Swiss-Prot record, chains A, B:
Fe cation binds at H129, D131, H207. The keyword Oxidoreductase applies. This is Dioxygenase andA. Keywords: Dioxygenase, Iron, Metal-binding, Oxidoreductase. Homodimer. It comes from the Eukaryota. It holds the Pfam family PhyH.
Length: 285, 285
């Protein structure tokens, strides 16, 4: 018996989605965002897609997730899309869920990164994995009781199905012990969904990209958030201060332009023994 | 039943110090740095003491270590002391020890912060604590088998004695379970050191600032390093790039101006899916 991927409409409230996410480790939330927003973001991203890296980045092994050369992962979305800085990073449903996940166990949260997941025609499935493997401390904690280190929110930019490689997930796989093998990709259900929908799964949910057996690319956008005490994979210190001061305080903290406090009230990422904003006089929308 | 704080001369090698720190959680290293280096750094620090905060920062609860107001902690040392930037951040003994601590279990390391510690006359002792309590994940890991999350190196800028509040340590206390009480500060040995020595202890070593019963301020310079995947308490994004470029690549990585790889080779603090330096074209020394 393989349990299916469960879905809620966003009009049912982020409590329903959060209860499915803590019982299964994954949930598809339908009609969570206006599809026109996503169309603008796909516009912006397609302009600059010819400048992205195919395969692994420099000096990173590829056998934990089966990182290969018919996928494109592209970052730097903050500079690429204003609609991303303005609409997506402030979506209140997403922050309702992320606050339910992170607030008591860890405190404030920010992005690990925002990432374009391009599964090219011909791309094979990845090895099912846990994303919290990125952080070494996660192997020294019991998954049944340890706090969540990562939450992934994936917005399909075109439609996700099984045949074009929509994300494969293993529901209810998020409490068991860490293992070097979990499942074969061919045994997992795919997250099927449309522009406007989002898939949400935790750093402990077993998942991976599927095989794109179609003749068009399958592209999603993944907002990955984590506790503020974990170092983001992507820094944003090179974003113009004048761009950053048109963003909201919450979104400025998301891209690392703000102090993050632990659930114990201690600040990380401070400037000159003060608040990040206070020390810079950083304005915001 | 109380073990003593063990010490070596830096001329006995980094490997001997490392052995003691592994058996005890703390080691005093004698004559590790020219006293003139520290003297210059202390003139630099004293010129700017009028801009420091006494006691807690805004919002940070105090009862876990007993932070009171006969105590001045002062960060922001990259812009205060040039000798700090050039000399202290490049001291080879320190990096040999931090390499032995961090490299297999975690990967690259960088500063939590460099912090001037001032126990003023009349300062009472702190409650003995473990420093890694700053990071919530430390409470979900078995101390006898889990990676080190922090190494503290403290240079006295004037003589540490018991009488003036020299750091109190519980040697061999670095493998026992986490507890909400470890010992009373009256029961602990003090670290007694000259300018030129250094105390090195880990984030699982039970310690605390002692009681300064003397007439003068007791001042040390703490250098707390942690794995690259933990968010530094102190950012350095407002150091002018011209200053940063006169530092070695190593010192640059220490103050957050570089990419940090985990032991599984994955990079963190990347810029544009590249190395921090490659994407900035950041020069160095
Ligand atoms: C564990 C592992 C990694 O960790 C994760 C999963 C964690 C975060 C994740 C998020 C959710 C942000 C995303 O959007 C897609 C992929 C990734 C960047 C990813 C990339 C990376 C470094 C990597 C690996 C490899 O093979 O090449 C690349 C790898 O094994
Ligand atoms: C756990 C705890 C904290 O964690 C530590 C110990 C960890 C790192 C440490 C280093 C070693 C860098 C240092 O140089 C001196 C003290 C401190 C900044 C310290 C400060 C802080 C946030 C805090 C506490 C409190 O009460 O106010 C402040 C507190 O209880
Ligand atoms: O492309 C996907 O659907 C999943 C991407 C992923 O899981 C990864 O590479 O970490
Ligand atoms: O002041 C000292 O000697 C110790 C300081 C300390 O342990 C702390 O505040 O974390
Ligand atoms: Fe993944
Ligand atoms: Fe301490």
């Amino acid at each position: 018996h393989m349990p299916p991927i469960r879905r809620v409409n966003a009009s049912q409230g982020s409590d329903a989605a959060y209860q499915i996410l803590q019982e299964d480790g994954c949930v598809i939330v339908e009609q969570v965002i206006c599809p026109n927003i996503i169309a603008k973001i796909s516009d912006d991203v397609n302009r600059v897609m010819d400048k992205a890296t195919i395969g692994a980045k420099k000096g990173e092994q590829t056998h934990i997730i089966n990182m290969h050369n018919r996928t494109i992962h592209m970052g730097d979305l903050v500079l690429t899309s204003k609609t991303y800085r303005d609409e997506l990073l402030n979506l209140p449903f997403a922050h309702e869920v992320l606050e339910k996940v992170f607030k008591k166990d860890s405190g404030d949260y920010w992005l690990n990164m925002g990432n374009i997941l391009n599964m090219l025609p011909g791309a094979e499935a990845q090895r099912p994995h846990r994303d919290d493997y990125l952080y070494p401390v996660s192997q020294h904690m019991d998954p049944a009781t340890s706090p969540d280190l990562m939450i992934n929110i994936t917005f399909p930019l075109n439609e996700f199905r099984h045949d074009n490689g929509g994300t494969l997930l293993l529901p209810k796989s998020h409490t068991g012990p860490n293992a070097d093998f979990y499942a074969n990709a061919e045994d997992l259900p795919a997250a099927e969904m449309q522009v406007g929908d989002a898939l949400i799964f935790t750093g402990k949910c077993v998942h991976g990209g599927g095989a794109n057996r179609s003749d068009k690319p399958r592209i999603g956008l993944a907002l990955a958030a984590q506790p503020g005490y974990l170092t983001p994979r992507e820094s944003n210190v090179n974003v113009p201060r004048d761009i950053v001061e048109t963003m909201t305080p919450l979104a400025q903290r998301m891209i690392g332009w703000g102090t993050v406090r632990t659930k114990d009230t201690y600040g990380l990422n401070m400037l000159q023994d003060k608040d990040f904003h206070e020390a810079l006089g950083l304005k915001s929308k």
